Design a protein around this ligand. Structure first.
Ligand SMILES: Cc1ccc(C(=O)Nc2cc(C(=O)N(C)C)cc(-c3ccc(C(=O)NO)cc3)c2)cc1
Ligand SMILES: Cc1ccc(C(=O)Nc2cc(C(=O)N(C)C)cc(-c3ccc(C(=O)NO)cc3)c2)cc1
Ligand code: NA
Ligand code: NA
Ligand SMILES: [Zn+2]
Ligand SMILES: [Zn+2]
Lengths: 348, 348
């Protein structure tokens, strides 16, 4: 059955740093509230060690990061303790997969895909996704990373754009001035890790229907033109309607079919989170996806949990798309899918 | 000359509160660097007292904020202090105007237009703009509040919904899911003040010419129809191209014109800053604008000051639009321009 990397101390840990909200708690609180945890194997995460974070980051960086982590912004205090934890969490998820414990491991507080080996970007100071991928390598030769967060999962792409052992697929918003700004379809990787990096530029207003069509064909091509052995899926919920981001118009269900599509492969999957700046909703989303993984249909009545009052004013689990246009012209998308399939003709 | 509300103590204040990043020193540091300050009157703000704040907020509210602000995130500590300091700063600006000390009073760290009398909203705890409006109402009768920050300045509209003594005009983005969510053009005030609340809902990618041209038409009709005596202008720099918000595609010049226009009126104007989450960008903007207020032209190159590295790699004060389309279907805009001009018939 799935593994849920959870421990009170970890949740409380992912609700700290000067500019952090209590999203870890709300997410757990609901998964707990619908009793989904009861259907999972809970594992308590470890705190990664400098030596482990260092598998991907430069000693120099970790040492500095740490140094500052106590001082604050003289970057706040905690970041290193914080990072160490989530990092540890992801690695624990990978370890369980590797140790044929589960075929699905979950770390919803992970997904910090904007960090580099020697640099922090997009409030990510550790690339817990790379650390897990690396960890999967020990038994899995080919790893596939799918990023469904609204932003480009550069950190990870970048981390591996020189090998063909790790393939990444990032569906993100791509518009001049939108962060990070990287990820156009022509960005296929470098040297030997060329054509093993996929990016699908989408625009605002895509809904469940078109988003999945793109998800599925792309994944379809990939799977057979890369034949992976393990998957790292990051599901940042900034594509879900409601979110400050106000860019895509998705609901947990769309993302849920994209999730089912992967799960069916029957491969070792590491499930991460990432953005989701509409607390209640992000919690609605990963709690929904956690149901998908369990094969349980969830009630639409938000239980009476410590954070109930925040699921106003309808207090139900479904999310309704905002009344916003799709600026996605259906043929441009076809131009991209085509391109990609071409790029894939170079993957062996 | 114009007044610049600066205080070492005020900038240190405004550059901290746990998740408050150093935007205040950046803006001063650059205005200071271009030596604009030398041509203004630097006035030290006062802090606001419970009573000054109470002018607009409920003692209950004021005291809750007060309490928490001591504890911290047990919302950090300071919030009350921060609020009362920034409030104090607008109050001072307005008194200067009232005393006919100057014609323009600047407080780039104010413009927290989302706060309610008894509720914080959109990161705003105190509504330092209202308090300044309420301070102008001692001497002035008809106050006009123009809000050119990406968002609807609802807290200040609400505050004056039933009075025809204050007219609020807000140009902002209005789209299903975009915060705060209010501001349609059909939100014209209530009872005694119906038609005294003006809202201009725009879409993404508007640039300097379309934007200005709209601004100018509403302000012309508003000026002739409401005939103001003092102005309160909020210039949140989140419309500028670059900015995380990736919504409008403006440069300080399109906003510089709106400001210049308002200034042609020769009325006591209070300038407030506001959103602007691209620090170097915001500083550039408000430095350009302060130069507008002074009527001076600035070096395209950035002087060398404490936050110099931060303005690279082309170290200049201009900003270039982004390659994103404008979604303001021309015909729809006019519809607004007309509903408004018709609404402005019933104003005395
Ligand atoms: C009140 C307020 C509201 C919003 C922002 C905001 O958007 N901040 C802000 C600025 C920037 C940015 O441009 N940088 C280069 C760091 C990036 C982000 C940002 C947003 C989302 C993600 C993300 O989804 N990571 O995968 C990363 C980074 C946020 C700041 C203040
Ligand atoms: C990484 C990250 C990036 C961005 C945000 C973010 O946008 N937060 C966030 C959430 C909400 C919200 O929905 N509320 C109900 C508070 C509103 C705002 C928000 C955004 C912009 C403004 C503003 O520009 N006022 O003029 C005010 C408030 C920001 C949060 C995290
Ligand atoms: Na996505
Ligand atoms: Na506005
Ligand atoms: Zn994101
Ligand atoms: Zn704003």
């Amino acid at each position: 059955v799935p593994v849920y990397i959870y421990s009170p101390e970890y949740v409380s840990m992912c609700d700290s740093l000067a500019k952090i909200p209590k999203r870890a708690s709300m997410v757990h609180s609901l998964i707990e509230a619908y009793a989904l945890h009861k259907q999972m194997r809970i594992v308590k995460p470890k705190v990664a060690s400098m030596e482990e974070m260092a598998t991907f980051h430069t000693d120099a960086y970790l040492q500095h990061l740490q140094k500052v982590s106590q001082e604050g912004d003289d970057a706040t205090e905690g970041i290193f303790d914080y990072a160490a934890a989530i990092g540890g969490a992801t690695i624990t998820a990978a370890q369980c997969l590797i140790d044929g414990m589960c075929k699905v491991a979950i770390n919803w507080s992970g997904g910090w895909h904007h960090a580099k080996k020697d640099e922090a970007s997009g409030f990510c100071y550790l690339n817990d996704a790379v650390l897990g991928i690396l960890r999967l390598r020990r038994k899995f030769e080919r790893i596939l990373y799918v990023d469904l967060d609204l932003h480009h999962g550069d950190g990870v792409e970048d981390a591996f754009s020189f090998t063909s052992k790790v393939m990444t697929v990032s569906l993100h918003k791509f518009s001049p001035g939108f962060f990070p700004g990287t990820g156009d379809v022509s960005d296929v990787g470098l040297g030997k890790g060329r054509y093993y990096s996929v990016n699908v530029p989408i625009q605002d207003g895509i809904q469940d229907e078109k988003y999945y069509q793109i998800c599925e064909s792309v994944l379809k091509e990939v799977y057979q033109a890369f034949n992976p052995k393990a998957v790292v899926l990051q599901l940042g919920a900034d594509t879900i309607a409601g979110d400050p981001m106000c860019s895509f118009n998705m609901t947990p269900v769309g993302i849920g079919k994209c999730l089912k599509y992967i799960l069916q492969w029957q491969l070792a999957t590491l499930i991460l989170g990432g953005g989701g700046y509409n607390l209640a909703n992000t919690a609605r989303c990963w709690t929904y996806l956690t149901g998908v993984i369990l094969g349980k249909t969830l009630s639409s009545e938000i239980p009476d949990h410590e954070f109930f009052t925040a699921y106003g004013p309808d207090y139900v689990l479904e999310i309704t798309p905002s009344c916003r246009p799709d600026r996605n012209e259906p043929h441009r998308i076809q131009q991209i899918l085509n391109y990609i399939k071409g790029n894939l003709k170079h993957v062996v």
